[PDB]
Amino acid sequence: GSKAVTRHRRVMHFQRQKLMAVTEY
Amino acid sequence: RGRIPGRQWIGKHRRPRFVSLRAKQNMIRRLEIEAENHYWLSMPYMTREQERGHAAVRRREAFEAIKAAATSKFPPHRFIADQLDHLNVTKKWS
RNA sequence: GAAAUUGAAACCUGGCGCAAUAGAUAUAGUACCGCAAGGGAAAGAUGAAAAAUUAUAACCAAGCAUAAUAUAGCAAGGACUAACCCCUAUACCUUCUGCAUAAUGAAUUAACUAGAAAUAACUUUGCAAGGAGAGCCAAAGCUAAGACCCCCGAAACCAGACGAGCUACCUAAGAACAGCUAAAAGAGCACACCCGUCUAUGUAGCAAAAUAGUGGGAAGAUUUAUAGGUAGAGGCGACAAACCUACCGAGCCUGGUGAUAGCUGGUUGUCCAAGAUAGAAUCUUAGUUCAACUUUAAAUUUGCCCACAGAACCCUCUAAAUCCCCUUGUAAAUUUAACUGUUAGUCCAAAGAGGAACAGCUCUUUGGACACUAGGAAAAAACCUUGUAGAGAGAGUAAAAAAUUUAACACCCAUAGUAGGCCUAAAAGCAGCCACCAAUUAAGAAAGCGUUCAAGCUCAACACCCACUACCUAAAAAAUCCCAAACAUAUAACUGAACUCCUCACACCCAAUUGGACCAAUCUAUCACCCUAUAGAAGAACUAAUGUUAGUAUAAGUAACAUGAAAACAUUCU
RNA sequence: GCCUGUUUACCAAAAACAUCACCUCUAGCAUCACCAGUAUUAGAGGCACCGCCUGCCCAGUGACACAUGUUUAACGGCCGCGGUACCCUAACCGUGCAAAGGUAGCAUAAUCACUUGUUCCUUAAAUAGGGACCUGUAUGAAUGGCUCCACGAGGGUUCAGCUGUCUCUUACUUUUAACCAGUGAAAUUGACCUGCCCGUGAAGAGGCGGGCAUAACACAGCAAGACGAGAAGACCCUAUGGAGCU
RNA sequence: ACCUCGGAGCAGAACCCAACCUCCGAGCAGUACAUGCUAAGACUUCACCAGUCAAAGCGAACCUCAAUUGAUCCAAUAACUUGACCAACGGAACAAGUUACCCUAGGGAUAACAGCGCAAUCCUAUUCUAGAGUCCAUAUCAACAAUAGGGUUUACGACCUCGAUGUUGGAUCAGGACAUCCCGAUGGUGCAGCCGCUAUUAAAGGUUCGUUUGUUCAACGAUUAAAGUCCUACGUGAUCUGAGUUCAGACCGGAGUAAUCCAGGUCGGUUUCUAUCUACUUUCAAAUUCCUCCCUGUACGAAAGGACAAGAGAAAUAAGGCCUACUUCACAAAGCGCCUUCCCCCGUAAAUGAUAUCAUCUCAACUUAGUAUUAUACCCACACCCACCCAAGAACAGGGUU
Ligand SMILES: [Mg+2]
Ligand SMILES: [Mg+2]
Ligand SMILES: [Mg+2]
Ligand SMILES: [Mg+2]
Ligand SMILES: [Mg+2]
Ligand SMILES: [Mg+2]
Ligand SMILES: [Mg+2]
Ligand SMILES: [Mg+2]
Ligand SMILES: [Mg+2]
Ligand SMILES: [Mg+2]
Ligand SMILES: [Mg+2]
Ligand SMILES: [Mg+2]
Ligand SMILES: [Mg+2]
Ligand SMILES: [Mg+2]
Ligand SMILES: [Mg+2]
Ligand SMILES: [Mg+2]
Ligand SMILES: [Mg+2]
Ligand SMILES: [Mg+2]
Ligand SMILES: [Mg+2]
Ligand SMILES: [Mg+2]
Ligand SMILES: [Mg+2]
Ligand SMILES: [Mg+2]
Ligand SMILES: [Mg+2]
Ligand SMILES: [Mg+2]
Ligand SMILES: [Mg+2]
Ligand SMILES: [Mg+2]
Ligand SMILES: [Mg+2]
Ligand SMILES: [Mg+2]
Ligand SMILES: [Mg+2]
Ligand SMILES: [Mg+2]
Ligand SMILES: [Mg+2]
Ligand SMILES: [Mg+2]
Ligand SMILES: [Mg+2]
Ligand SMILES: [Mg+2]
Ligand SMILES: [Mg+2]
Ligand SMILES: [Mg+2]
Ligand SMILES: [Mg+2]
Ligand SMILES: [Mg+2]
Ligand SMILES: [Mg+2]
Ligand SMILES: [Mg+2]
Ligand SMILES: [Mg+2]
Ligand SMILES: [Mg+2]
Ligand SMILES: [Mg+2]
Ligand SMILES: [Mg+2]
Ligand SMILES: [Mg+2]
Ligand SMILES: [Mg+2]
Ligand SMILES: [Mg+2]
Ligand SMILES: [Mg+2]
Ligand SMILES: [Mg+2]
Ligand SMILES: [Mg+2]
Ligand SMILES: [Mg+2]
Ligand SMILES: [Mg+2]
Ligand SMILES: [Mg+2]
Ligand SMILES: [Mg+2]
Ligand SMILES: [Mg+2]
Ligand SMILES: [Mg+2]
Ligand SMILES: [Mg+2]
Ligand SMILES: [Mg+2]
Ligand SMILES: [Mg+2]
Ligand SMILES: [Mg+2]
Ligand SMILES: [Mg+2]
Ligand SMILES: [Mg+2]
Ligand SMILES: [Mg+2]
Ligand SMILES: [Mg+2]
Ligand SMILES: [Mg+2]
Ligand SMILES: [Mg+2]
Ligand SMILES: [Mg+2]
Ligand SMILES: [Mg+2]
Ligand SMILES: [Mg+2]
Ligand SMILES: [Mg+2]
Ligand SMILES: [Mg+2]
Ligand SMILES: [Mg+2]
């Protein structure tokens, strides 16, 4: 388990990624 | 050639899964259905202050019926007819 | 673990046990092992007439030919007119969160082997203020019946007996040592002899310690034939914890003993239902006891989001939330008695810590997922969908496919007041100071390179035409060999689960655990005798424990292996 | 290490145990070994010849006298700092302790890491070997220190001459090797219709996904893999399971 | 480092929650004993053992602080009471050190070598420039500043592996990769020519002869273009050796009363498997390079010196064959003797041209070195087969028998 803030970007969750991809500008 | 570290779904360096078009359309239609539900759930009827006790009688009757059904548990009746007709195992041509 | 106390009916011949892996080990304490005590195992099947050596009674397991192979793949399923060809699909039980994993066990067949039981509990007869075949209990009790709690595997200790025939020591009588140099010698080389420093051969061999020399001694602290003695809380020891009958930091046999052991493994037929872990204590985290949850039948009524309202803080912020909560959706919530088990679990997201703002690392809280089914993401253990089960060659759905590719430039044009002011020799437009002037159209006492002090080149400013005069920057290379293939151009729809529906009735997919119903070989009583039922008892079931015994395949017709030649078989040759 | 010898029978045969020389303590003595012996004897202990020698201590232990003591060749121990002329190693003095503050000798050694030490030689090339030095703060005088007459299946190096260990292997015979005749194993086996690459999984796939690969069946040699065969690992850890020593 | 308990944040607004997370402490105290006796109702350190508040009455005049502590049994006293630093504080009434002479039931839950995820430790390639290189960042070096790849090595955790993963080298055998020493091809230079550096493409090969220390480490003598790196179980023990590293003996020095022990040193210390399965058994071949001779003593410097390129001749490694001439020694087979080995590999230098009427080598349409090659030789007759021979050969198979 990693922390909330890291340097390697850290890929988000699948649902969060889907939400960010469907709610773009 | 490209090797993935320990488990491509958990850990640090993981294989990233992306989104296509079917998932986007599904999310769009689900958000539309949920917005329709929000719109249909934006209008009451009694405004809370008009239901202090309208169907409490039915709930009380149902609770009394459940109590009467749960407190009426008893072993079934025992008759002699079974013990008498059990003797028909060794029945001949009578 | 008693005692005092009422008390305790002479005589009758079987097995609701078995038939050679059972029952005594037994046909027998036989073979075999050691000098010794002692340990110690399978055996025998035709028949009335074997003085019927006849023709038959065959048919079932593991191993074989009859009758080998025919491409592809945990050996299986779906199937069609035909074995393969088409699609799907990662052996079995276990310590483990997760095992076919390259962890544990297994070659099969046949026989045997593993839940034995009290106080307190549950159910059903009988009697009843009494029950009970003396004794005990009793403010609805007493008696009886049913129901229940494994196996195997160590090093250690004592008691009774045995060993110095190999080896340690001692005692009495004997034997052994060519030859040469023999300096007089616990002298040298060297036969036989005592021991074995090294090489080579084999480690299921000749051998549970061998083969040749290179080796030391070989007139003495040497070796050996015979007989006796020193034995475990000990013997012996030129001391190696060396030896004491092939396994002595402490022997063999028997009894304690089926010793104990938080430690390993295994634990036998079917269906259905319920069923997943806030913690504390312990010379304890590999265990145990109590919390919490799970299992049955009863008694009571309230269990969950509930709402206006309620839950001091202080300097500086103080979030997402929580606690009591009649309505509404619900049928569940507490207690009674017996109780087994969880109490050695992970990942993801959120709120924190150690660590490197590292880990598939650890410590707390909440939710989800897994050790229960399927589908998609390539195979998947934490990503998404989805939960209560079939037959049918039915239908409708959930999740379900990645796009990026870009670095250009202006066409021409430049005289002078001066070497504007100063340490260094001078820095004359780029070493520092305030003011950084001034001429014709128009150019900076200097906006970018080459200059100890000067020359060489552009740009801004006229003269001259006058495109965009710039979406700002955002790419990488390790070791067997890179990986499915393809299409920028016939119209957004379609495909797609165990989710839902169609005819049926619906108990027929969680770890440990608990509850309810059937099933079969034995004997006994009751009916039938071409084989089943009602009741009582069990030595009542084996795909597994490097489980015991007997048969037999792969390994494998694999390694090892014999006998000197001719011959009248009277002989001859190395 | 005095020597010969012996010790771990069955992985170490040695510097390991013993041996004459030396030193310490105890005993006034007749029947069963000691011993049919008498303080030139016997028993209990340490090193182990010959040459130079063994310097100190009873505060602590034991032993002997109970007279406060003796014993160390009985158990064990023999300093630190400051002032100290140009450079280390100091002459000397002061200070506190105590039995003495390392005596002789020897060496960077079988000797804590610094240590491949200065330097000479043996080789053209030497942490290998020998020679003169101790800051050896952890050598050291019977837990004895060193040369020396002889010796060692003990541990290391080298000179004149030679052996295919190699450059670079080869010529032959036997055992053995390949086939024929038979007895005929042992370990081991869940079943196999048993190929390769990339990627994944309990983290190293012939049985999982995508690709490549494919008529079937024996003989003769090598090891790359099947984490292959033999020992419930002797190394690390647990056990209120043991045993040996002090 | 700790063994009991309390407080402050983690745990923020009812409650509970741990760490070998960071801090204050406590084993008590300054003053009267009505600090007398009974008795409704509650909290309860997540169980129990324990602790705390209190209605009211009889009795009497009119309690402060946060942890602040001790149970069963037994002992002292006629009685009310009292006794442990039982600190291992839910507390056996009293037990130390070692086993490398060890045993047993187990654990990769919990280890030494490995394989595994990031990387505390590095290189490579760049953004920008403080400082050096005579002026001068990019010929080159590089810090205070940033981005991408990896584990060479030491370490983080022990995820299949204690019913067994053999551990450092060397001999033999090699495979892959460049972060390239070289021969192949470029541009610049603080490149005057042979000596050097920077950046790119290319792996068809070599990476020596020796010593001693135990070495993969490390030290020194002689060459060319080099004595390159990493991974392959820190490659390879069913192929080979242990020089140490993992035992039982002993010696020196040290700790320790002794026993015992040493990442301080030394002497020697058994190395076992008949190939079951996959896979292999010439892939037939088109090499590489050093030196010398006229040019060469020429460009170059002030002098040393020496090439770029071409032609010719002699030579080293590997592969394909031979016995007739040298050797092993003989109706045969090998090397020490002899013959041959033939083609490249992508980075620039330059005309015309518009987009952008100049210029422009082109991830535009094209022209030159600028792609060798769609290369060439072994070997390709279906069957006569008892037996004999053979330069052919394990059997089989291969050739001859006129
Ligand atoms: Mg992986
Ligand atoms: Mg009596
Ligand atoms: Mg019997
Ligand atoms: Mg028997
Ligand atoms: Mg059969
Ligand atoms: Mg198939
Ligand atoms: Mg089973
Ligand atoms: Mg187990
Ligand atoms: Mg595990
Ligand atoms: Mg297995
Ligand atoms: Mg295991
Ligand atoms: Mg097995
Ligand atoms: Mg004897
Ligand atoms: Mg002896
Ligand atoms: Mg003699
Ligand atoms: Mg002799
Ligand atoms: Mg000894
Ligand atoms: Mg037992
Ligand atoms: Mg335990
Ligand atoms: Mg974890
Ligand atoms: Mg863990
Ligand atoms: Mg000018
Ligand atoms: Mg469908
Ligand atoms: Mg359904
Ligand atoms: Mg269920
Ligand atoms: Mg039985
Ligand atoms: Mg049974
Ligand atoms: Mg069976
Ligand atoms: Mg076995
Ligand atoms: Mg069995
Ligand atoms: Mg074979
Ligand atoms: Mg043979
Ligand atoms: Mg013979
Ligand atoms: Mg000797
Ligand atoms: Mg021996
Ligand atoms: Mg002997
Ligand atoms: Mg020996
Ligand atoms: Mg001695
Ligand atoms: Mg002395
Ligand atoms: Mg030393
Ligand atoms: Mg040598
Ligand atoms: Mg000797
Ligand atoms: Mg044969
Ligand atoms: Mg799996
Ligand atoms: Mg693989
Ligand atoms: Mg396998
Ligand atoms: Mg074990
Ligand atoms: Mg314990
Ligand atoms: Mg014990
Ligand atoms: Mg005991
Ligand atoms: Mg004992
Ligand atoms: Mg409580
Ligand atoms: Mg009061
Ligand atoms: Mg305790
Ligand atoms: Mg405690
Ligand atoms: Mg030892
Ligand atoms: Mg010993
Ligand atoms: Mg063991
Ligand atoms: Mg490791
Ligand atoms: Mg500068
Ligand atoms: Mg582990
Ligand atoms: Mg292991
Ligand atoms: Mg195994
Ligand atoms: Mg093995
Ligand atoms: Mg390159
Ligand atoms: Mg050499
Ligand atoms: Mg290795
Ligand atoms: Mg191997
Ligand atoms: Mg071997
Ligand atoms: Mg030896
Ligand atoms: Mg074969
Ligand atoms: Mg195989």
JSON list of C-alpha atoms (C1' of nucleotides) in Angstrom, two decimals, chain C residues 227-272:
[
{"chain": "C", "resi": 227, "resn": "A", "atom": "C1'", "xyz": [43.06, -70.31, 29.50]},
{"chain": "C", "resi": 228, "resn": "G", "atom": "C1'", "xyz": [41.03, -66.67, 33.34]},
{"chain": "C", "resi": 229, "resn": "G", "atom": "C1'", "xyz": [39.46, -61.67, 35.48]},
{"chain": "C", "resi": 230, "resn": "U", "atom": "C1'", "xyz": [37.91, -55.93, 35.38]},
{"chain": "C", "resi": 231, "resn": "A", "atom": "C1'", "xyz": [30.26, -53.80, 32.71]},
{"chain": "C", "resi": 232, "resn": "G", "atom": "C1'", "xyz": [26.83, -49.23, 32.83]},
{"chain": "C", "resi": 233, "resn": "A", "atom": "C1'", "xyz": [24.79, -44.51, 39.74]},
{"chain": "C", "resi": 234, "resn": "G", "atom": "C1'", "xyz": [30.16, -48.44, 35.38]},
{"chain": "C", "resi": 235, "resn": "G", "atom": "C1'", "xyz": [34.79, -51.33, 33.02]},
{"chain": "C", "resi": 236, "resn": "C", "atom": "C1'", "xyz": [39.17, -49.53, 30.72]},
{"chain": "C", "resi": 237, "resn": "G", "atom": "C1'", "xyz": [42.06, -45.47, 28.98]},
{"chain": "C", "resi": 238, "resn": "A", "atom": "C1'", "xyz": [50.82, -44.11, 26.49]},
{"chain": "C", "resi": 239, "resn": "C", "atom": "C1'", "xyz": [43.35, -38.87, 27.38]},
{"chain": "C", "resi": 240, "resn": "A", "atom": "C1'", "xyz": [41.16, -40.12, 21.13]},
{"chain": "C", "resi": 241, "resn": "A", "atom": "C1'", "xyz": [34.54, -38.32, 25.88]},
{"chain": "C", "resi": 242, "resn": "A", "atom": "C1'", "xyz": [38.48, -43.54, 21.93]},
{"chain": "C", "resi": 243, "resn": "C", "atom": "C1'", "xyz": [36.63, -48.78, 22.79]},
{"chain": "C", "resi": 244, "resn": "C", "atom": "C1'", "xyz": [32.66, -52.20, 25.67]},
{"chain": "C", "resi": 245, "resn": "U", "atom": "C1'", "xyz": [29.99, -57.93, 19.20]},
{"chain": "C", "resi": 246, "resn": "A", "atom": "C1'", "xyz": [28.94, -54.06, 12.19]},
{"chain": "C", "resi": 247, "resn": "C", "atom": "C1'", "xyz": [24.56, -48.03, 14.91]},
{"chain": "C", "resi": 248, "resn": "C", "atom": "C1'", "xyz": [28.49, -45.78, 23.04]},
{"chain": "C", "resi": 249, "resn": "G", "atom": "C1'", "xyz": [28.61, -37.73, 25.06]},
{"chain": "C", "resi": 250, "resn": "A", "atom": "C1'", "xyz": [26.94, -43.76, 27.39]},
{"chain": "C", "resi": 251, "resn": "G", "atom": "C1'", "xyz": [24.64, -51.36, 24.83]},
{"chain": "C", "resi": 252, "resn": "C", "atom": "C1'", "xyz": [21.55, -55.36, 23.58]},
{"chain": "C", "resi": 253, "resn": "C", "atom": "C1'", "xyz": [16.37, -58.20, 25.98]},
{"chain": "C", "resi": 254, "resn": "U", "atom": "C1'", "xyz": [11.87, -57.95, 29.26]},
{"chain": "C", "resi": 255, "resn": "G", "atom": "C1'", "xyz": [8.42, -55.06, 32.55]},
{"chain": "C", "resi": 256, "resn": "G", "atom": "C1'", "xyz": [6.89, -50.12, 33.91]},
{"chain": "C", "resi": 257, "resn": "U", "atom": "C1'", "xyz": [4.26, -48.47, 28.55]},
{"chain": "C", "resi": 258, "resn": "G", "atom": "C1'", "xyz": [-0.91, -48.55, 24.11]},
{"chain": "C", "resi": 259, "resn": "A", "atom": "C1'", "xyz": [4.81, -43.67, 28.66]},
{"chain": "C", "resi": 260, "resn": "U", "atom": "C1'", "xyz": [4.38, -38.35, 27.56]},
{"chain": "C", "resi": 261, "resn": "A", "atom": "C1'", "xyz": [4.85, -34.96, 23.73]},
{"chain": "C", "resi": 262, "resn": "G", "atom": "C1'", "xyz": [1.05, -27.03, 22.48]},
{"chain": "C", "resi": 263, "resn": "C", "atom": "C1'", "xyz": [4.82, -31.29, 17.13]},
{"chain": "C", "resi": 264, "resn": "U", "atom": "C1'", "xyz": [3.54, -34.23, 11.64]},
{"chain": "C", "resi": 265, "resn": "G", "atom": "C1'", "xyz": [-0.05, -37.03, 8.81]},
{"chain": "C", "resi": 266, "resn": "G", "atom": "C1'", "xyz": [-4.73, -39.52, 8.14]},
{"chain": "C", "resi": 267, "resn": "U", "atom": "C1'", "xyz": [-10.00, -39.81, 9.84]},
{"chain": "C", "resi": 268, "resn": "U", "atom": "C1'", "xyz": [-14.58, -44.22, 5.87]},
{"chain": "C", "resi": 269, "resn": "G", "atom": "C1'", "xyz": [-22.35, -43.39, 1.91]},
{"chain": "C", "resi": 270, "resn": "U", "atom": "C1'", "xyz": [-26.45, -39.51, 0.08]},
{"chain": "C", "resi": 271, "resn": "C", "atom": "C1'", "xyz": [-29.68, -34.87, 0.26]},
{"chain": "C", "resi": 272, "resn": "C", "atom": "C1'", "xyz": [-31.31, -30.15, 2.47]}
]
